[PDB]
Every structure is written in C-alpha cells, then in structure tokens.
Design a protein around this nucleic acid. Structure first.
Ligand SMILES: Nc1ncnc2c1ncn2[C@H]1C[C@H](O)[C@@H](COP(=O)(O)OP(=O)(O)OP(=O)(O)O)O1
Ligand SMILES: [Ca+2]
Ligand SMILES: [Mn+2]
Length: 430
DNA sequence: ATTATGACGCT
DNA sequence: AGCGTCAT
C-alpha cells in the first residue's frame, strides 16, 4: 500500500534520431531528401550491405542487413548513399561527428548518457522541478505538446492519426492535477514539454528529426520512444503500464531480446511482459539469478532504478574489419598490412580524441576471428598503449596474436583470419 | 558474405 | 583478464 514504491521518482527521456545515417546523407545531398533511400557499405558483394533505411523505403519492405541488390528488387527506384572508405575499410567518421552535433545540443538541457551513436538518455527530474516553479500552477496547453502521444489514450467515448493523437492528449490534459507539484503524471507532462523543446532545438540546429520517449525510467523511455516514430514523442505513464504490458512480447523490452528473454518465455511458459507479475521475486531469482530476478520483478510492474549515467563520450575507440569467405587473411604480410590500416585509422581517431576531450587511452585490445569459429571473437588479448603511433600499435598487435598461427611456414597464416579488431580502452585524464 | 561498432556482466 | 551477451 503506502510503503510500496512505485518507481515514479524520476523523469527520464530517451531521444533517438530517425533513420540516422540516412538523415546525415540527406542533409548533405538534397537530392536524397523525401525519397526512398538507404545507406550501404561496400558495393562489390551483392550491391553492398544496407545499414540504414528511410521511412519511404521501409514502405517497400527494405530493411537493414538486406543486400542492396535485393533491396532493389523490392524498390527499383531506391536511392543509395555509400559509407566512406578509407585505408581499405568502411569509415564511420561522418556519422560520429554528426552524433556529436546532436549530443552537444542535448547536453544544454540536461546531463545525458550516450547510449549509441544516435541516442541518449536524459535525466529531466531537476529540469522539471524548475519549470514547474516557473509555471506557477498554470495549466499546460496542448499547444506546448504538438508532437506528443499519450500511450493508452484516447479511451472510451476519430478517423485520422493526428486526430487520434489530439484526442488522447486532450483526455490526458483534461485530467491532470496541476495543483500538485509532486504529481508524477504532471512531472512527466512537464518532461514532455521540455523534450518538445529539445527536439525542436535539435532539428533547428542540425536539420535532423528524432523521436523520443518520456517516462519514469530508462527501459520505459526507450520502449515509449519506439511506439510512435518517426518525428514524434510518446509519454508512457506509470498508470499506462498494466495495459501496455498485457500484450507486450517479452523480447521488446531492452535486455530481453536475446537468450535470457527466450529463457523467460520457455521456462515460465508465458509470452507477455505483464504475465511476469504472477511470479514471486524469489521465483524469478530462482530461474534467472538474483540480479535478473529482482530486475524482472520490478520491471514487469514498470519499475527500474538504472541511473542515467553522466557520460557523453564513448568509453572506447575501436576499429574492426571482417574478411569473409575467400578474402580471409592467409599470409603474414596480409595480416600485417591490415593491422597497420586499422592502426592508422585508430591513431587518427585517438589523436583527435586527445585534443578534443583531454584524455588518453592506456590499453590496446586486439581481437581476431579464425575461419570456422561461429563466435564474433575467437581470441582477445590486451597490451599496453603507451604512444599514439600506428606502426607501434600494429607491431604490438601482431606480437600478441602471432602465436595464433598454427602454420609451420613463417609466411603463411593458418587458419586464415576472418576478423581483425583494435580497440583503445582505459582512458586517463590528460 | 548480417558489417562496424560499443557497453556491461560473469568468473 | 578474457569471454559472453545484448545492443545500435
Ligand atoms: N546492425 C548495425 N550495423 C551497422 N550499423 C548500424 C546497425 N544498426 C544501426 N546502425 C547504425 C545505422 C543507423 O542509422 C544508426 C542508428 O540505428 P537505429 O536507431 O537502430 O536505426 P535508425 O536510426 O537507422 O532508424 P530508426 O528511425 O528506426 O531509429 O546506427
Ligand atoms: Ca534511430
Ligand atoms: Mn538508436
């Protein structure tokens, strides 16, 4: 009852860019705007692999991971932009730099956690408290929430989508008690007002549109964000959770999309997040471990405590390349040349990072895959990173992997390598 | 031949 | 430390 925590203490948003790499290319090349288009890497094999798709192209069934030649079968007029190639490999610098543009704007509003190249969590609890004081018990106008959906509404007592959106928003607002400065629903609503302002700033200052979720924690914020994309934001209230979760496949919740989620489904014989409420905390801990069990018990009730971490910059800087099929590296000279290519890109990025962010990496991690292993990585070895020098780093990487080679012949490399990976880690201030 | 990343958990 | 999971 009165002592039962409801996980309504925070206001958390997740802001996620719409079809991000496509928007970056569309800003650069106006011919691509408002077109079915996709971003591809490489080209020789089956037209290249698609890694981002405009909403116009999605209407034709084009998806990520599709080969461009196959996408063209669904969408003959599909336009394509290619990822830059440098030193023999795809180079994602343009998108990393565009990401920084967006993250720096968001950081003006609140402390952010960089969650990926195109999304960040926002802890808006303090910003909401301040805006609530400014408002002075003044009601929130629908005009302040022009792209906001209220999940679960309208209900009860209608043909167009925008019409439905406004209907739901009006029901929500009509209900709100603006007298209570600690009402969680009011706090979320003010959060949504701030996120409208954040999203407007991002679009004004970069040209990029985005979607957002506003709720009381990171998992619900992220779930919310995807409900109404693109170019819209969704508020998921604590009260909306039972209905929302009653038909929500377990795999849709962040961290449950893989083996653990499949095990929850199999072991418990359920399908939807809401069905988890019928198990005790101890029951869930017995199957999934102490940490997961406690997390699931709270999460299926809409409660999670994972903090928005104050981290705007990536913790690692890495360079990787696959060598599939017949292109697998089978000579020592090959392995060395590609280690150097990777190290040269890594040095470039590290040197820029040091100048921009006043820090230095101290550990180099080297990872490879060998033909036949189905695992992402076959072997991971670390060594000291003492100088930002590509020739040194590539020589050091070779040293820590060279024993991998089962070939008797010095020159030959066996089994061939199907992946190389260099990663700079363990930053220290400088 | 679903590539190039990046964070975090386990032991 | 080195490996595995989950994610975009
Ligand atoms: N599996 C991947 N491999 C390589 N790049 C990826 C992969 N997934 C995502 N990316 C890149 C390209 C995306 O534009 C960008 C952001 O990913 P993501 O948010 O999942 O989709 P998206 O921004 O392209 O479309 P959406 O509007 O559905 O969010 O990160
Ligand atoms: Ca996105
Ligand atoms: Mn994303």
């Amino acid at each position: 009852g009165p002592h039962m925590a409801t996980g309504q203490d925070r206001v958390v948003a997740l802001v996620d860019m719409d079809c991000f790499f496509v928007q970056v290319e569309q800003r650069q090349n106006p011919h691509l705007r408002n077109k079915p288009c996709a971003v591809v890497q490489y080209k020789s094999w089956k037209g290249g692999g698609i890694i981002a798709v405009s909403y116009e192209a999605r209407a034709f069934g084009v998806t990520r991971s599709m080969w461009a030649d196959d996408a063209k079968k669904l969408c003959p007029d599909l336009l394509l932009a290619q990822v830059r190639e440098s030193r023999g490999k795809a180079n994602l610098t343009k998108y990393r730099e565009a990401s920084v543009e967006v993250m720096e704007i968001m950081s003006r509003f609140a402390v952010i956690e960089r969650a990926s190249i195109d999304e960040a969590y926002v802890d808006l609890t303090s910003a909401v408290q301040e805006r609530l004081q400014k408002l002075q018990g003044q009601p929130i106008s629908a005009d302040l929430l022009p792209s906001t959906y209220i999940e679960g509404l309208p209900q009860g007592p209608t043909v167009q989508k925008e019409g439905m959106r406004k209907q739901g928003l009006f029901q929500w607002l009509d209900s709100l008690q603006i007298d209570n400065l600690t009402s969680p629903d009011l706090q979320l609503t003010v959060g949504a007002v701030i996120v409208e302002e954040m999203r407007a700033a991002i679009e004004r200052e970069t040209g990029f549109q985005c979607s957002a979720g506003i709720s009381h924690n990171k998992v619900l914020a992220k779930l919310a964000c995807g409900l109404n994309k693109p170019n819209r934001q969704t508020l998921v209230s604590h009260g909306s959770v039972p209905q929302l979760f009653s038909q929500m496949p377990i795999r849709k919740i962040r961290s449950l999309g893989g083996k653990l989620g499949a095990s929850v489904i199999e072991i418990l014989g359920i399908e939807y997040m809401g069905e988890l409420t019928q198990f005790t905390e101890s029951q869930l801990q017995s199957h999934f471990g102490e940490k997961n069990g406690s997390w699931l018990y709270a999460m299926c009730r809409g409660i999670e405590h994972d903090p928005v971490k104050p981290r705007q910059l990536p913790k690692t800087i890495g360079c990787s390349k696959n060598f599939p099929g017949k292109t697998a590296l089978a000579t020592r000279e090959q392995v060395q040349w590609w280690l150097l290519q990777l190290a040269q890109e890594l040095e470039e990025r590290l040197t820029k990072d040091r100048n921009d962010n006043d820090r230095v990496a101290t550990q180099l991690v080297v990872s490879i895959r060998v033909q036949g292993d189905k695992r992402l990585s076959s072997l991971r070895r670390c060594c000291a990173l003492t100088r930002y020098d590509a020739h040194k780093m590539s020589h050091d990487a070779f040293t820590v992997i060279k024993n991998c080679n089962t070939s008797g012949i010095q020159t030959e490399w066996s089994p061939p390598l199907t992946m190389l990976f260099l990663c700079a880690t363990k930053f220290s201030a400088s």
